[PDB]
Amino acid sequence: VYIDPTQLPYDHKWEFPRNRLSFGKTLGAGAFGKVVEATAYGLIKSDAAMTVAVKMLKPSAHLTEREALMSELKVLSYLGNHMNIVNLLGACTIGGPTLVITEYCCYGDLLNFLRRKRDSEDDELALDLEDLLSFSYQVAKGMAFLASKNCIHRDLAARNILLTHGRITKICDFGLARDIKNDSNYVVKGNARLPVKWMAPESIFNCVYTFESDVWSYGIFLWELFSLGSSPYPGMPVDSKFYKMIKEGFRMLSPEHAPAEMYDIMKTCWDADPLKRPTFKQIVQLIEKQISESTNHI
Amino acid sequence: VYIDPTQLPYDHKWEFPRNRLSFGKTLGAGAFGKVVEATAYGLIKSDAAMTVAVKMLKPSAHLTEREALMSELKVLSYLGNHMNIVNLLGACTIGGPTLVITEYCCYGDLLNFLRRKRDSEDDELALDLEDLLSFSYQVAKGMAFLASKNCIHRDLAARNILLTHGRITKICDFGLARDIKNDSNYVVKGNARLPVKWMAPESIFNCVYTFESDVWSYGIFLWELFSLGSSPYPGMPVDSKFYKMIKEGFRMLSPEHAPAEMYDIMKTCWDADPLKRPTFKQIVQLIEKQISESTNHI
């Protein structure tokens, strides 16, 4: 049974005075919200200031978005700390609109990182592959953690993975801080704009999100990861024929640089039967083995 | 008092049967020697084969080179294991010419790695700087280890630094496995071809090699490191005017992307007074501080 975010607690140990925040550049924004870099004085050590990210709503937000941001705060507090998630550091729930303070990741999102690597010899090939295997491993570990907490991400994709010091990757969710109106990867399906090319068939046709639909999305993520940031199903618009092709079982081919075993993981993530897809804990063990064998590769 | 390699022991615990080696590609070669990749069956685990590097002489070698390679074996056995040195794994001292078996580094030398990075946005700039700081730190730690064993390298330079899995750097010495006749970075000075642009003035003018002359060479290494592999003193040939300019105190300017504190380290490595140059253990602590402060940088 997946978590109901509205029925999680909020611990005032997270409370931080908003006047100790100094806001900087906007890191992302959508219609109703934004994430902004900031300096937080005294957040961790009383005499130290540190860089954080702050998610907040815009004045155009309604009750639904206000409740959504408080629910996000509650989820982040409930999840606790994991190396491969963006971690909560504090919050401002009094003295003004809700502010949610998290870690700042210094290299931006993985999608942009990948697309520069492709807008660019076997040694470089090999080193890039070492990084990509690491990224696949870290994301699977962060997702296994989310699943262990009965949490569903619902929008896993390279654009929702951040890179920071040490080439550590952290899963995030820009959510309301993304301009999905102007992001072609989000397409109108009924009443909402959804990332359909990342979504499992049961999510598309039944609006059902599960542990297993997150795994499907992880498979698409692996494909963009080893395609250096290409959009999935290249050349195909999301329309009537795309839905039928997915129902009949058509799938993307392997990326040209994906290792054979990473392609096999992709394929199993895209099984039409959710019960046949691997779990994230199973994926972690499979990638661990590939990394372990990669020290045997020259 | 620096080690006399000829008066070090050889422990037959290192002995490995040469028929268990399967030779592959040549990794480097000079007039008298070469380093070759190989598979070694049973070197560490009795049923496992692993990739190694093997240094060996060519049939043109004389007694002087044969003694040199045995001395190299002895030095490597005496140094023992350090993460940031190429480590000895075994040797073949019977049944044929001397073979010296070491770790294989899978990404090649740092000089070539750097020159591809320059034959190629703030996020990429920042990530490259994180790597370069790491490389400077790891090389200083390997050199501090060599100095602690009263060992002098005598040819420290990016071409003698290897990169391997995990972006770990290992100091090496291709030595006789380098074609210094055809490497313009080695210039005739008297009877030998020496890497003069990397050499301290006391080494050039008195043929004296010390702990402090290694530090000078490390300073030049930092310059090529932050110049993405450019040759030092660009545009200046090594001739009469170069020697006088170095004697009078002229030095290279900062690389454009070197952090201020890494430039200050460079400058102190190039002090005309060897007793005023930092030790490698002092350099390790200074770079540790820069890396620690780099998590404060966005």
Ligand SMILES: CCc1cc(NC(=O)Nc2ccc(-c3cnc(Nc4cc(N5C=CN(CC)C=C5)ncn4)s3)cc2)no1
């Ligand atoms: C997973 C479970 C979950 C999470 C969640 N909420 C949730 O993640 N909010 C949320 C909070 C925080 C963030 C961010 C944290 N750091 C960020 N850094 C950057 C840097 C960047 N750069 C671009 C360019 N340059 C060169 C100048 C540098 C930097 N560009 C964009 N962003 S963005 C994202 C989303 N809810 O559930």
Ligand SMILES: CCc1cc(NC(=O)Nc2ccc(-c3cnc(Nc4cc(N5C=CN(CC)C=C5)ncn4)s3)cc2)no1
């Ligand atoms: C420090 C104290 C000391 C050391 C010492 N002796 C001492 O280091 N010998 C010595 C032993 C071993 C080595 C080497 C170990 N691994 C190496 N790998 C590569 C890889 C490479 N690639 C190029 C291209 N590609 C794409 C196909 C892949 C790989 N190219 C060149 N080399 S070279 C060097 C020198 N004596 O004292």
